PDB file of all heavy atoms in Angstrom:
ATOM      1  N   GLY V 157     109.039 114.314 201.474  1.00 30.14           N
ATOM      2  CA  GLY V 157     109.603 113.824 200.195  1.00 30.14           C
ATOM      3  C   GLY V 157     110.783 112.937 200.483  1.00 30.14           C
ATOM      4  O   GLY V 157     111.327 112.928 201.592  1.00 30.14           O
ATOM      5  N   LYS V 158     111.148 112.185 199.490  1.00 33.13           N
ATOM      6  CA  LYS V 158     112.349 111.313 199.547  1.00 33.13           C
ATOM      7  C   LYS V 158     113.384 111.699 198.522  1.00 33.13           C
ATOM      8  O   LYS V 158     113.030 112.033 197.387  1.00 33.13           O
ATOM      9  CB  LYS V 158     111.960 109.842 199.346  1.00 33.13           C
ATOM     10  CG  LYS V 158     110.988 109.294 200.490  1.00 33.13           C
ATOM     11  CD  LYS V 158     111.581 109.362 201.832  1.00 33.13           C
ATOM     12  CE  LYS V 158     110.635 108.632 202.851  1.00 33.13           C
ATOM     13  NZ  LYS V 158     111.158 108.969 204.179  1.00 33.13           N
ATOM     14  N   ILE V 159     114.645 111.461 198.856  1.00 32.75           N
ATOM     15  CA  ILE V 159     115.772 111.686 197.928  1.00 32.75           C
ATOM     16  C   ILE V 159     116.362 110.350 197.745  1.00 32.75           C
ATOM     17  O   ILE V 159     116.921 109.763 198.701  1.00 32.75           O
ATOM     18  CB  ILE V 159     116.838 112.688 198.560  1.00 32.75           C
ATOM     19  CG1 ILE V 159     116.167 114.029 198.847  1.00 32.75           C
ATOM     20  CG2 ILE V 159     117.991 112.805 197.585  1.00 32.75           C
ATOM     21  CD1 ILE V 159     117.100 114.924 199.802  1.00 32.75           C
ATOM     22  N   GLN V 160     116.273 109.827 196.517  1.00 33.39           N
ATOM     23  CA  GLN V 160     116.695 108.428 196.252  1.00 33.39           C
ATOM     24  C   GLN V 160     118.068 108.476 195.570  1.00 33.39           C
ATOM     25  O   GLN V 160     118.337 109.205 194.536  1.00 33.39           O
ATOM     26  CB  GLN V 160     115.660 107.724 195.356  1.00 33.39           C
ATOM     27  CG  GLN V 160     115.501 108.223 194.041  1.00 33.39           C
ATOM     28  CD  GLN V 160     114.291 107.486 193.420  1.00 33.39           C
ATOM     29  OE1 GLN V 160     113.160 107.990 193.591  1.00 33.39           O
ATOM     30  NE2 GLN V 160     114.495 106.248 192.858  1.00 33.39           N
ATOM     31  N   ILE V 161     118.933 107.586 196.072  1.00 32.02           N
ATOM     32  CA  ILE V 161     120.231 107.415 195.428  1.00 32.02           C
ATOM     33  C   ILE V 161     120.640 105.935 195.278  1.00 32.02           C
ATOM     34  O   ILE V 161     120.034 105.120 195.908  1.00 32.02           O
ATOM     35  CB  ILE V 161     121.378 108.111 196.199  1.00 32.02           C
ATOM     36  CG1 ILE V 161     121.484 107.531 197.606  1.00 32.02           C
ATOM     37  CG2 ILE V 161     121.101 109.641 196.194  1.00 32.02           C
ATOM     38  CD1 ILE V 161     122.809 108.085 198.405  1.00 32.02           C
ATOM     39  N   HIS V 162     121.559 105.656 194.331  1.00 32.73           N
ATOM     40  CA  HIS V 162     122.199 104.339 194.313  1.00 32.73           C
ATOM     41  C   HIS V 162     123.276 104.293 195.363  1.00 32.73           C
ATOM     42  O   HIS V 162     123.730 105.307 195.966  1.00 32.73           O
ATOM     43  CB  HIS V 162     122.782 104.146 192.929  1.00 32.73           C
ATOM     44  CG  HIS V 162     121.751 103.883 191.910  1.00 32.73           C
ATOM     45  ND1 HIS V 162     121.681 104.564 190.760  1.00 32.73           N
ATOM     46  CD2 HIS V 162     120.688 102.981 191.904  1.00 32.73           C
ATOM     47  CE1 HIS V 162     120.651 104.070 190.006  1.00 32.73           C
ATOM     48  NE2 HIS V 162     120.043 103.110 190.710  1.00 32.73           N
ATOM     49  N   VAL V 163     123.760 103.072 195.662  1.00 32.10           N
ATOM     50  CA  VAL V 163     124.785 102.925 196.659  1.00 32.10           C
ATOM     51  C   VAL V 163     126.070 103.652 196.215  1.00 32.10           C
ATOM     52  O   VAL V 163     126.811 104.227 197.032  1.00 32.10           O
ATOM     53  CB  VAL V 163     125.012 101.415 197.025  1.00 32.10           C
ATOM     54  CG1 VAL V 163     126.145 101.342 197.950  1.00 32.10           C
ATOM     55  CG2 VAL V 163     123.777 100.916 197.701  1.00 32.10           C
ATOM     56  N   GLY V 164     126.333 103.522 194.923  1.00 34.03           N
ATOM     57  CA  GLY V 164     127.427 104.284 194.393  1.00 34.03           C
ATOM     58  C   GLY V 164     128.541 103.412 193.782  1.00 34.03           C
ATOM     59  O   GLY V 164     128.342 102.544 192.905  1.00 34.03           O
ATOM     60  N   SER V 165     129.756 103.615 194.297  1.00 34.39           N
ATOM     61  CA  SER V 165     130.966 102.965 193.804  1.00 34.39           C
ATOM     62  C   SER V 165     131.156 101.561 194.361  1.00 34.39           C
ATOM     63  O   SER V 165     130.754 101.327 195.490  1.00 34.39           O
ATOM     64  CB  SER V 165     132.088 103.926 194.291  1.00 34.39           C
ATOM     65  OG  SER V 165     133.367 103.374 194.133  1.00 34.39           O
ATOM     66  N   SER V 166     131.888 100.693 193.633  1.00 30.14           N
ATOM     67  CA  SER V 166     132.283  99.405 194.192  1.00 30.14           C
ATOM     68  C   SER V 166     133.822  99.310 194.300  1.00 30.14           C
ATOM     69  O   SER V 166     134.351  98.192 194.402  1.00 30.14           O
ATOM     70  CB  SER V 166     131.756  98.212 193.352  1.00 30.14           C
ATOM     71  OG  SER V 166     132.253  98.342 192.052  1.00 30.14           O
ATOM     72  N   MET V 167     134.517 100.442 194.299  1.00 31.57           N
ATOM     73  CA  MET V 167     136.003 100.437 194.478  1.00 31.57           C
ATOM     74  C   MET V 167     136.397  99.693 195.760  1.00 31.57           C
ATOM     75  O   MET V 167     135.772  99.873 196.781  1.00 31.57           O
ATOM     76  CB  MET V 167     136.557 101.849 194.452  1.00 31.57           C
ATOM     77  CG  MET V 167     136.466 102.504 193.053  1.00 31.57           C
ATOM     78  SD  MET V 167     137.565 101.752 191.794  1.00 31.57           S
ATOM     79  CE  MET V 167     139.106 102.244 192.573  1.00 31.57           C
ATOM     80  N   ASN V 168     137.493  98.896 195.684  1.00 33.02           N
ATOM     81  CA  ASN V 168     137.992  98.065 196.793  1.00 33.02           C
ATOM     82  C   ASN V 168     137.046  96.918 197.144  1.00 33.02           C
ATOM     83  O   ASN V 168     137.249  96.266 198.151  1.00 33.02           O
ATOM     84  CB  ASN V 168     138.298  98.815 198.086  1.00 33.02           C
ATOM     85  CG  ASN V 168     139.222 100.011 197.901  1.00 33.02           C
ATOM     86  OD1 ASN V 168     140.047 100.028 196.999  1.00 33.02           O
ATOM     87  ND2 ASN V 168     139.071 101.021 198.772  1.00 33.02           N
ATOM     88  N   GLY V 169     136.033  96.694 196.309  1.00 33.01           N
ATOM     89  CA  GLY V 169     135.134  95.551 196.450  1.00 33.01           C
ATOM     90  C   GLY V 169     133.817  95.916 197.176  1.00 33.01           C
ATOM     91  O   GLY V 169     133.697  96.988 197.839  1.00 33.01           O
ATOM     92  N   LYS V 170     132.877  94.982 197.106  1.00 33.74           N
ATOM     93  CA  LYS V 170     131.528  95.246 197.616  1.00 33.74           C
ATOM     94  C   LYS V 170     131.454  95.476 199.091  1.00 33.74           C
ATOM     95  O   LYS V 170     130.860  96.465 199.504  1.00 33.74           O
ATOM     96  CB  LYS V 170     130.529  94.170 197.169  1.00 33.74           C
ATOM     97  CG  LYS V 170     130.143  94.370 195.702  1.00 33.74           C
ATOM     98  CD  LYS V 170     129.204  93.272 195.211  1.00 33.74           C
ATOM     99  CE  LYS V 170     127.803  93.521 195.706  1.00 33.74           C
ATOM    100  NZ  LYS V 170     126.897  92.377 195.351  1.00 33.74           N
ATOM    101  N   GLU V 171     132.052  94.620 199.927  1.00 36.22           N
ATOM    102  CA  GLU V 171     131.903  94.798 201.380  1.00 36.22           C
ATOM    103  C   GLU V 171     132.498  96.118 201.878  1.00 36.22           C
ATOM    104  O   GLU V 171     131.837  96.792 202.667  1.00 36.22           O
ATOM    105  CB  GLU V 171     132.433  93.558 202.168  1.00 36.22           C
ATOM    106  CG  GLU V 171     133.906  93.598 202.441  1.00 36.22           C
ATOM    107  CD  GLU V 171     134.461  92.353 203.192  1.00 36.22           C
ATOM    108  OE1 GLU V 171     134.371  92.340 204.439  1.00 36.22           O
ATOM    109  OE2 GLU V 171     135.012  91.419 202.541  1.00 36.22           O
ATOM    110  N   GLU V 172     133.680  96.506 201.382  1.00 35.76           N
ATOM    111  CA  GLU V 172     134.308  97.807 201.751  1.00 35.76           C
ATOM    112  C   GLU V 172     133.413  98.949 201.303  1.00 35.76           C
ATOM    113  O   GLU V 172     133.272  99.946 202.005  1.00 35.76           O
ATOM    114  CB  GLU V 172     135.680  97.974 201.115  1.00 35.76           C
ATOM    115  CG  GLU V 172     136.731  97.167 201.951  1.00 35.76           C
ATOM    116  CD  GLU V 172     138.185  97.485 201.651  1.00 35.76           C
ATOM    117  OE1 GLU V 172     138.515  98.675 201.436  1.00 35.76           O
ATOM    118  OE2 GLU V 172     139.012  96.497 201.691  1.00 35.76           O
ATOM    119  N   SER V 173     132.836  98.735 200.138  1.00 39.02           N
ATOM    120  CA  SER V 173     131.989  99.808 199.528  1.00 39.02           C
ATOM    121  C   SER V 173     130.696  99.989 200.292  1.00 39.02           C
ATOM    122  O   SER V 173     130.211 101.147 200.438  1.00 39.02           O
ATOM    123  CB  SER V 173     131.707  99.484 198.056  1.00 39.02           C
ATOM    124  OG  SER V 173     132.909  99.652 197.227  1.00 39.02           O
ATOM    125  N   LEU V 174     130.112  98.892 200.813  1.00 37.35           N
ATOM    126  CA  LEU V 174     128.922  99.016 201.688  1.00 37.35           C
ATOM    127  C   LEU V 174     129.252  99.740 203.024  1.00 37.35           C
ATOM    128  O   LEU V 174     128.454 100.586 203.512  1.00 37.35           O
ATOM    129  CB  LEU V 174     128.250  97.613 202.026  1.00 37.35           C
ATOM    130  CG  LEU V 174     127.776  96.923 200.760  1.00 37.35           C
ATOM    131  CD1 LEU V 174     127.261  95.524 201.199  1.00 37.35           C
ATOM    132  CD2 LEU V 174     126.630  97.703 200.107  1.00 37.35           C
ATOM    133  N   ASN V 175     130.415  99.384 203.614  1.00 36.76           N
ATOM    134  CA  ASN V 175     130.752 100.009 204.858  1.00 36.76           C
ATOM    135  C   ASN V 175     131.136 101.484 204.667  1.00 36.76           C
ATOM    136  O   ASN V 175     130.721 102.288 205.520  1.00 36.76           O
ATOM    137  CB  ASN V 175     131.810  99.170 205.541  1.00 36.76           C
ATOM    138  CG  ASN V 175     131.150  97.950 206.275  1.00 36.76           C
ATOM    139  OD1 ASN V 175     130.163  98.102 207.081  1.00 36.76           O
ATOM    140  ND2 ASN V 175     131.629  96.781 205.974  1.00 36.76           N
ATOM    141  N   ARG V 176     131.755 101.825 203.540  1.00 35.58           N
ATOM    142  CA  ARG V 176     132.036 103.263 203.248  1.00 35.58           C
ATOM    143  C   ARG V 176     130.682 104.004 203.074  1.00 35.58           C
ATOM    144  O   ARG V 176     130.526 105.141 203.559  1.00 35.58           O
ATOM    145  CB  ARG V 176     132.812 103.524 201.950  1.00 35.58           C
ATOM    146  CG  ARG V 176     134.287 103.059 202.036  1.00 35.58           C
ATOM    147  CD  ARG V 176     135.123 103.715 200.880  1.00 35.58           C
ATOM    148  NE  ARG V 176     134.479 103.599 199.555  1.00 35.58           N
ATOM    149  CZ  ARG V 176     134.516 102.509 198.807  1.00 35.58           C
ATOM    150  NH1 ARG V 176     135.233 101.416 199.207  1.00 35.58           N
ATOM    151  NH2 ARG V 176     133.865 102.477 197.662  1.00 35.58           N
ATOM    152  N   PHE V 177     129.699 103.343 202.473  1.00 31.58           N
ATOM    153  CA  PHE V 177     128.423 104.061 202.350  1.00 31.58           C
ATOM    154  C   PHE V 177     127.852 104.384 203.722  1.00 31.58           C
ATOM    155  O   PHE V 177     127.350 105.469 203.977  1.00 31.58           O
ATOM    156  CB  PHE V 177     127.457 103.197 201.557  1.00 31.58           C
ATOM    157  CG  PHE V 177     126.101 103.849 201.387  1.00 31.58           C
ATOM    158  CD1 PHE V 177     125.808 104.505 200.188  1.00 31.58           C
ATOM    159  CD2 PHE V 177     125.113 103.794 202.413  1.00 31.58           C
ATOM    160  CE1 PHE V 177     124.593 105.205 200.035  1.00 31.58           C
ATOM    161  CE2 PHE V 177     123.933 104.463 202.219  1.00 31.58           C
ATOM    162  CZ  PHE V 177     123.620 105.145 201.043  1.00 31.58           C
ATOM    163  N   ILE V 178     127.782 103.353 204.566  1.00 31.17           N
ATOM    164  CA  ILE V 178     127.230 103.519 205.934  1.00 31.17           C
ATOM    165  C   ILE V 178     128.026 104.595 206.753  1.00 31.17           C
ATOM    166  O   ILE V 178     127.380 105.469 207.378  1.00 31.17           O
ATOM    167  CB  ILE V 178     127.233 102.186 206.678  1.00 31.17           C
ATOM    168  CG1 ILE V 178     126.167 101.267 206.029  1.00 31.17           C
ATOM    169  CG2 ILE V 178     126.900 102.418 208.180  1.00 31.17           C
ATOM    170  CD1 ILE V 178     126.174  99.827 206.570  1.00 31.17           C
ATOM    171  N   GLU V 179     129.370 104.562 206.645  1.00 33.15           N
ATOM    172  CA  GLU V 179     130.185 105.542 207.369  1.00 33.15           C
ATOM    173  C   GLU V 179     129.829 106.969 206.943  1.00 33.15           C
ATOM    174  O   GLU V 179     129.656 107.833 207.779  1.00 33.15           O
ATOM    175  CB  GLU V 179     131.689 105.278 207.187  1.00 33.15           C
ATOM    176  CG  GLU V 179     132.500 106.095 208.252  1.00 33.15           C
ATOM    177  CD  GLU V 179     134.004 106.319 208.063  1.00 33.15           C
ATOM    178  OE1 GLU V 179     134.621 105.814 207.106  1.00 33.15           O
ATOM    179  OE2 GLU V 179     134.548 107.059 208.927  1.00 33.15           O
ATOM    180  N   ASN V 180     129.751 107.181 205.616  1.00 37.24           N
ATOM    181  CA  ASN V 180     129.555 108.547 205.150  1.00 37.24           C
ATOM    182  C   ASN V 180     128.096 108.977 205.334  1.00 37.24           C
ATOM    183  O   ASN V 180     127.820 110.140 205.603  1.00 37.24           O
ATOM    184  CB  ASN V 180     129.911 108.627 203.650  1.00 37.24           C
ATOM    185  CG  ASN V 180     131.467 108.471 203.416  1.00 37.24           C
ATOM    186  OD1 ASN V 180     132.209 108.501 204.421  1.00 37.24           O
ATOM    187  ND2 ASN V 180     131.934 108.287 202.233  1.00 37.24           N
ATOM    188  N   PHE V 181     127.144 107.998 205.231  1.00 37.28           N
ATOM    189  CA  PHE V 181     125.772 108.303 205.541  1.00 37.28           C
ATOM    190  C   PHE V 181     125.610 108.887 206.972  1.00 37.28           C
ATOM    191  O   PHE V 181     124.852 109.818 207.233  1.00 37.28           O
ATOM    192  CB  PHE V 181     124.884 107.025 205.414  1.00 37.28           C
ATOM    193  CG  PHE V 181     123.511 107.232 205.909  1.00 37.28           C
ATOM    194  CD1 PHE V 181     122.539 107.910 205.140  1.00 37.28           C
ATOM    195  CD2 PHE V 181     123.152 106.666 207.136  1.00 37.28           C
ATOM    196  CE1 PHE V 181     121.202 108.133 205.665  1.00 37.28           C
ATOM    197  CE2 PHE V 181     121.878 106.864 207.617  1.00 37.28           C
ATOM    198  CZ  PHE V 181     120.872 107.557 206.893  1.00 37.28           C
ATOM    199  N   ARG V 182     126.393 108.300 207.886  1.00 39.42           N
ATOM    200  CA  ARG V 182     126.259 108.645 209.308  1.00 39.42           C
ATOM    201  C   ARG V 182     126.839 110.056 209.609  1.00 39.42           C
ATOM    202  O   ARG V 182     126.663 110.547 210.728  1.00 39.42           O
ATOM    203  CB  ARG V 182     127.015 107.552 210.119  1.00 39.42           C
ATOM    204  CG  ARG V 182     126.070 106.347 210.270  1.00 39.42           C
ATOM    205  CD  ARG V 182     126.829 105.199 210.881  1.00 39.42           C
ATOM    206  NE  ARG V 182     125.936 104.057 211.037  1.00 39.42           N
ATOM    207  CZ  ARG V 182     126.352 102.848 211.342  1.00 39.42           C
ATOM    208  NH1 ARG V 182     127.677 102.592 211.466  1.00 39.42           N
ATOM    209  NH2 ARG V 182     125.423 101.873 211.446  1.00 39.42           N
ATOM    210  N   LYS V 183     127.533 110.631 208.644  1.00 40.84           N
ATOM    211  CA  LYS V 183     128.026 112.024 208.785  1.00 40.84           C
ATOM    212  C   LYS V 183     127.050 113.042 208.197  1.00 40.84           C
ATOM    213  O   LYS V 183     127.304 114.271 208.270  1.00 40.84           O
ATOM    214  CB  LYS V 183     129.351 112.140 208.100  1.00 40.84           C
ATOM    215  CG  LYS V 183     130.411 111.331 208.792  1.00 40.84           C
ATOM    216  CD  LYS V 183     131.666 111.370 207.942  1.00 40.84           C
ATOM    217  CE  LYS V 183     132.733 110.494 208.586  1.00 40.84           C
ATOM    218  NZ  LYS V 183     133.841 110.555 207.565  1.00 40.84           N
TER     219      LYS V 183
END
């Protein structure tokens, strides 16, 4: 099965928000 989510927040702008997603995904 899959668990689908949106990227989430755009606080501090899009590029910071993409890298925060990747950082927390990796934990």
Side-chain angles (χ1 to χ4, degrees):
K158 298 300 187 191
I159 300 166
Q160 65 187 89
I161 60 172
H162 286 129
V163 175
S165 169
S166 58
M167 291 292 294
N168 307 331
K170 284 177 78 186
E171 86 182 276
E172 280 194 39
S173 288
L174 299 175
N175 279 309
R176 290 197 312 280
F177 179 99
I178 290 173
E179 195 197 357
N180 290 350
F181 172 78
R182 278 172 180 169
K183 293 173 183 175

